[PDB]
Amino acid sequence: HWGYGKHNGPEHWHKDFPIAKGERQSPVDIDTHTAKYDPSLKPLSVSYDQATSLRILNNGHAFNVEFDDSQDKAVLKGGPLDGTYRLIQFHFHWGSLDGQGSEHTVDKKKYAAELHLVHWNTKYGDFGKAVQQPDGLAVLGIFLKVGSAKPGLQKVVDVLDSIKTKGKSADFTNFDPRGLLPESLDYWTYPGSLTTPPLLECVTWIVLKEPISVSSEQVLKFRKLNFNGEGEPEELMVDNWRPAQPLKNRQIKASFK
Ligand SMILES: CC(=O)OC[C@H]1O[C@@H](O[C@H]2[C@H](OC(C)=O)[C@@H](OC(C)=O)[C@H](S(N)(=O)=O)O[C@@H]2COC(C)=O)[C@H](OC(C)=O)[C@@H](OC(C)=O)[C@H]1OC(C)=O
Numbered sequence: 261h262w263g264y265g266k267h268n269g270p271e272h273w274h275k276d277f278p279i280a281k282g283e284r285q286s287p288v289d290i291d292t293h294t295a296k297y298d299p300s301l302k303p304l305s306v307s308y309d310q311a312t313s314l315r316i317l318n319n320g321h322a323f324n325v326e327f328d329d330s331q332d333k334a335v336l337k338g339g340p341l342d343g344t345y346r347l348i349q350f351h352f353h354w355g356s357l358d359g360q361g362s363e364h365t366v367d368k369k370k371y372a373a374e375l376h377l378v379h380w381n382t383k384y385g386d387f388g389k390a391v392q393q394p395d396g397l398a399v400l401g402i403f404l405k406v407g408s409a410k411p412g413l414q415k416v417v418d419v420l421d422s423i424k425t426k427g428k429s430a431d432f433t434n435f436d437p438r439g440l441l442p443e444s445l446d447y448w449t450y451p452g453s454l455t456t457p458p459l460l461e462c463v464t465w466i467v468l469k470e471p472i473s474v475s476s477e478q479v480l481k482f483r484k485l486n487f488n489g490e491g492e493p494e495e496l497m498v499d500n501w502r503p504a505q506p507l508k509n510r511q512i513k514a515s516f517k
């Protein structure tokens with residue numbers, strides 16, 4: 261189906277998902293000198309104290325750490341958000357080289373990787389209904405740069421060997437997502453879409469200004485994963501990022517000056 265290769269990559273997605281050329285697609289380049297500081301933006305509230313992780317799965321495009329979202333255990337509120345959004349999963353997008361990998365860019369600068377913590381608006385009952393709404397999801401995006409190791413990320417790095425190929429999953433309970441957050445919660449926000457097919461335009465993007473640092477050793481293990489399934493020719497899971505899309509009729513707001 262769709263992928264990140266030359267014959268099934270981002271350039272081809274519009275054929276099966278025409279919304280790929282839509283009015284509010286993601287990611288986008290964040291021009292820091294065009295973003296407007298919005299003093300009306302309420303404080304961002306990340307409540308991950310009761311977060312309940314369940315499993316880690318290699319889905320052939322990236323790996324997802326899933327959470328129990330039957331209750332308001334881990335939620336995102338405040339900021340440009342109205343209501344409560346429950347955390348359902350997080351995953352990353354990374355490159356084959358340290359100079360690329362992130363989906364959003366800042367003044368055209370590409371980071372080594374990007375973490376996406378996905379949340380859905382509880383007013384819609386379930387994730388499936390939420391993705392069909394303009395304000396159905398809220399995704400917290402965090403850039404990763406290569407530097408010092410990130411303690412909170414090692415638990416994830418340690419289990420990647422058990423889900424090397426597509427379809428593989430492993431138990432992943434008691435993981436605290438709070439360990440992946442930078443010190444500052446300053447952010448940029450704009451209305452966008454999922455960055456992978458079906459590319460639904462149901463996302464309120466909240467991209468943090470401050471990146472987190474990960475070690476070269478940690479990123480290297482990400483690059484050892486496989487897009488292919490067990491018993492098939494090896495295709496390293498790298499460069500699973502969509503490039504920046506036209507901003508069009510949208511404004512990016514900043515929570516800071
Ligand atoms: C289109 C549809 O019917 O439902 C929407 C889809 O939601 C997908 O979940 C994420 C996706 O997680 C993945 C791919 O595991 C997420 O991260 C990716 C693709 O790497 C992207 S992203 N980059 O914008 O954060 O968004 C997708 C939308 O859901 C979000 C943001 O929470 C589901 O899993 C996928 C695509 O793998 C996907 O499941 C499919 C397709 O079978 C689909 O959900 C449904 C109803 O199946």
Ligand SMILES: [Zn+2]
Binds near residue numbers: 351352353376455
């Ligand atoms: Zn993503």
